[PDB]
Amino acid sequence: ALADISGYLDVLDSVRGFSYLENAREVLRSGEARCLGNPRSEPEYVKALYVIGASRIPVGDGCSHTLEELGVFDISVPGEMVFPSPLDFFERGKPTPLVRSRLQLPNGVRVWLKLEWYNPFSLSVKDRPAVEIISRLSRRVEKGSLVADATSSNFGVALSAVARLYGYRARVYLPGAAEEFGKLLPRLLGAQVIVDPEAPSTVHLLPRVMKDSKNEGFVHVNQFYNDANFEAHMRGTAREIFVQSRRGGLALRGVAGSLGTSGHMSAAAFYLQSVDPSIRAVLVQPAQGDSIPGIRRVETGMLWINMLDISYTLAEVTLEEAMEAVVEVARSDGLVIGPSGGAAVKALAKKAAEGDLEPGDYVVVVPDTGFKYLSLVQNALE
Template identity: 45%
Template sequence: MSTKNLQTHLVELEQLHPHEEVDLNHLKELIQQIASDGVLKYAIVADCKTNVILDGEHRYTALKNLGCKRIPVVYVDYNSPNIEVQAWRENYRLTKRDVIEAALSGKRLPPKTSRHMVRNSDVLVHISTIEQKVDVPLEVLKSELTYVPLETVKTAMQVDLKDTLQVYARFLKTETVDTPLVLDRKTKVLLDGYEAFQALELLSVRIVPAFKVDINKVEVKAAEGLTKEAIIKAAIEGVKLPPKSFTIMGGEVRISIPLKKLRGTERHDVKTLRVYSGSLELLLGGWPTPLVKLNSLSTNGRSVWAKLEGYNPFSNSVKDRIAWYMIKEAMEKGEFKHILYEATSTNTGIALTSVANILGAKVKLYIPMTVQRTSDIYLKVLGAKVVRLPISLTVEAISQVDAEAKAHGAAHLNQFENDANFKAHLKHTAREIDQQLTSLGLKPTCVVGGLGTSGHMSAISLYFKTKYGDEVKIVGVQPAKNEVIPGIRRIETGMKWIQWTTFDQIVDVTQREAIEAAINIARKEGLLVGLSSGAVVHAFQKIAQEKGVYVLIFPDSGYKYAEQFEKYFENEPSNGQN
């Protein structure tokens, strides 16, 4: 019988069935010996189908007397022809069936009745030869298996990733966790099971199976000079010892816990796992966009949150919302045409072209000369036709775009006048912010955002002013006079929806201030945001009070504005150093 694939399992004592009585004198000596050793040195053997003990009744009974709850067991198939049962007494016939019936009926055989043998390379040897040396501490065997939040476990030792990956592969393939962790009860420092712990981290479990022991009551097999106190100190201070510096188990013992149990109520529907049937579903399924706390701007009495519209998939901006809604409403009204004309400073153009591509439509875009040249490249990649106009503001192109669209039989959706713009933000963006804050038990004190078409900030203002009244302040942000900040403009250039609601304050920001605030967010929060987001940050810093809940609307990411950042660093080279 090959012992190569035999494993030792930690089994609850009450699950096992002894088939023989024990010799009380031998039992007394064994209890004293095990208690003195502080460990159980060898596993017992049991039948895998019936849990009948085949060898090790005295160890089983000794552990019961010592208050243990589990025992290491090597399981075998008792029906195997490689296992034989003999009787110690002469002229006494004993069968496997006799052994099973004695165990399961509770009518145990006298001590030293059976002798189990295994065939190893055609030689019969006593079954004890397959009992693996485990040296499991009694503290572990006395402990209940508990489930501990993974993040509460403290580690004191590094782990070789190659060793971990073997355990990881086993857990993943079987969907079962078979290795227990051992923790110090008081400090939750991991004493054994480091490869298993790292594997469970990689498998994203929430809780881990662990036995809790008193480190002072177990023998720690450690590198020379390494004390128990040093192990605890290393874990608490975060100083990791070299791999395999210590252990408390003498051999491998297995448990069996379904991996899904450790992951908790993990949902496996396609929405939770972010699987989408198409690009449009990717857009809609990505809402709500994240709301993230800006710790660099928050204080003890003030929390500051950024609504990250750069997480929209097409233009990486808030404009994805209106592009879809304008096209959707045009289709619902029967006004959609497969040629679209639009004036844009970049983001709406990218968003419209992306959605149009999905629907098989063509797009022609009109862009002011003041807009960064990289926009042309992005739009051409998407297949849009780009026309540069000698104007400073996108809104100045509306009449020309409208006339050319009519002349060529194209649709001009006109983001500056199309109420789908406003409705998209009233239905989604504003409500998302409210729901996200409510989930934290918060209500906004102030919302700060840039004014471009005025669609998103007007909708946000109407929503929060209607629901909370003057408890919520709405602050709009515009470029200072004679300044250009992509994506936002001054109120006097004409904004439709701003007339529908109330703004408590309008803050002017220069391009330099916007760029420097965006750089500050990148260096403090790790978020590369656009210039209009930087303008919002600077405006917040102008009006912020010591207390309150502030929401800053970040319309897009910063990747499109390399030219503006480059020019700034040319003029301010010292600011290029972090």
């Protein structure tokens, strides 16, 4: 029949590698999953179902079940929006909103904005990998232990709140150019903060964090390499775009977004392209010389967007163009989005103007709120 997946999640601690994603892709492509005789004997298939958002798995001898039958489309949110704890609110208070913009783009490209600031700890998309990452730790790593990572600002905040709710201590490392909220808010939340005014980037800090890890023995959760980041976005962000698009009546032709770790947009593109491989992924390339907070250029070794069978198209965006999009979204929708969000809107507008996109509905993932970036806002005004 069906069994509750929550009983089988130790496969998250034992499955390794990307091969399980073949099952994920096929179940999503076909719209259904085959019965697992002994579910414990097919740990890859079980992880595949978890990662696409199933809450139930098919077991025993018997027939295949559809995505809907596996819970992929179940409603989690209580309609009255009352929650017994902050973590329960994070988990069941989903999806994040998907809102049609009044901003007009060329060639029949209709914009919808997915507002990831609607996450309770960091007011950003980074809550999701923080929760998934800390959760995966929490029965191999003893309480009281120190966990740490490098961050542009958002993950550090998320990691600080979530580490403490799970009984861990945290430390976050930031580059000198990070926003003030990233430097300060983790201390509010009880974490240690190290700012390296030398470091020109978040990734530039990773050798130092690794070395301190070896010396001091804290757990480096490494969001740039930890697959729980990608997994969080498969079951959360990406599934939601899929479910929201079907249930909302959208003619989904593409998603648009930005890349730091590449975690959220790799998941969105991977998930959606499993269901329909023509769905586009338009991704921001910050123009050379420019810094758009939280994000960076593909070249390098970002993990998932390169290693996974993902189709995408890049558009160059300058910081000035990104902030101009912030301005225009604000004046069109009354919504105040962050620079990376503006950059994504602009990348979609550019591809739309070139004639490269089928008319239809396009989802832009807006990683956070522009309230956090006042000095960039001021510059953009003049």
